[PDB]
Design a protein that fits this description.
Its cofactor is Zn(2+); Mn(2+); Ca(2+); Mg(2+). The protein is an all-beta fold. The protein has 1 helix and 25 strands. Bound molecules: 1,5-anhydro-D-glucitol (ASO) (2 copies) and calcium ion.
């Protein structure tokens, strides 16, 4: 049977990112990186709250003790939603001229993974290999996993908590590492899927309840479903906008997919071809469920 696609919020984000489903409020959290906004859309009332920060905010996540955590500039921060406040928990890449965090997600043991990159001086030009992947442990200690990253993007973990999947966008590949739940350690990087030319630039990524990976293709106007064990693409889902950035599952028992995208870098023309660009899209009828997001344990 067929899927259905709806722009549930035509937010016109410059670069909508980091969609996270908050089931306790039935809301979708997301960011708009250059507007420095963290946003929350209530799926029932249709209302959106936005809090404005003081630097680019590249990701947001749940925090078990209350409120949220976020990556703002090169800083791991705690976000007081009620007070619109951010306290710095830790900082990385102090030695970089101009890096910022990019994509981030909480692991199955409550560690906040997030990687960095150089800040695009120009869409889309950026210093090479200036990023690294980090994780914020519950005890506020930061681990550095590897560097030489171009653009740290999509990431998630296998359902048996033994594999970590990772996208550095300029590798045009989805990679895998062995992963240890008890220590947060990873090793033995190998490629699991190299994108075809029409799939363009791999961006955000999430896993589903069957263990398959869904990857947002920036400029490919699609998300693709991948089987990491066989290495084959299972399915392609095309969207009305080209600059699809990330994806997550949400709605009742995680049966719907939410997709973010970007308006930045669009020409006057494409804007008339894609007026919904930068919006939040919902996809129903996939027949697969995702899994709940994890919450930072510090
Ligand atoms: O141009 C950089 C941007 O490209 C789109 C990515 O989804 C976003 O995370 C990144 O910051
Ligand atoms: O009903 C909630 C459940 O929906 C199915 C998801 O796979 C699971 O992670 C989630 O906890
Ligand atoms: Ca991204």
């Amino acid at each position: 049977s067929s899927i259905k696609i709806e722009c549930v919020l035509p937010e016109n984000c410059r670069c909508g990112e980091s969609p996270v489903w908050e089931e306790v409020s039935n809301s979708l959290l997301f960011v708009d990186i250059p507007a420095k906004k963290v946003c929350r859309w209530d799926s029932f009332t249709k209302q959106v709250q936005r809090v404005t920060m003081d630097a680019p905010v590249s990701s947001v996540a749940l925090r078990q003790s209350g409120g949220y955590v976020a990556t703002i500039g090169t800083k791991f921060c705690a976000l007081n939603w009620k007070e619109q406040s951010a306290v710095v928990l830790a900082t990385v890449d102090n030695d970089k001229k101009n890096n910022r965090f990019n994509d981030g997600k909480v692991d199955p043991a409550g560690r906040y993974f997030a990687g960095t990159m150089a800040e695009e001086t120009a869409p889309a030009v950026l210093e090479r290999h200036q990023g690294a992947l980090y994780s914020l442990f519950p005890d506020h200690h930061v681990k550095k996993y590897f560097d030489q990253v171009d653009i740290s993007n999509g990431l998630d973990w296998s359902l048996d908590h033994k594999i970590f999947y990772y996208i550095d966008s300029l590798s045009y590949s989805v990679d895998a590492f062995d992963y240890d739940l008890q220590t947060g350690q990873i090793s033995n990087r190998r490629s699991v899927y190299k994108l075809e030319k029409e799939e363009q630039i791999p961006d955000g990524m999430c896993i589903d309840a069957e263990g398959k990976l869904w990857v947002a293709c920036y400029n490919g106007g699609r998300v693709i479903r991948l089987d990491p064990v066989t290495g084959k693409r299972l399915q392609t889902v095309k969207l009305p906008v080209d600059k699809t950035t990330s994806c997550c599952f949400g709605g009742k028992n995680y049966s719907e997919m939410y997709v973010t995208c970007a308006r930045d870098g669009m020409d006057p023309e494409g804007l008339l071809r894609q007026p919904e660009a930068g919006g939040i899209f919902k996809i129903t009828g996939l027949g697969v469920k995702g899994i709940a997001p994890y919450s930072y344990a510090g």
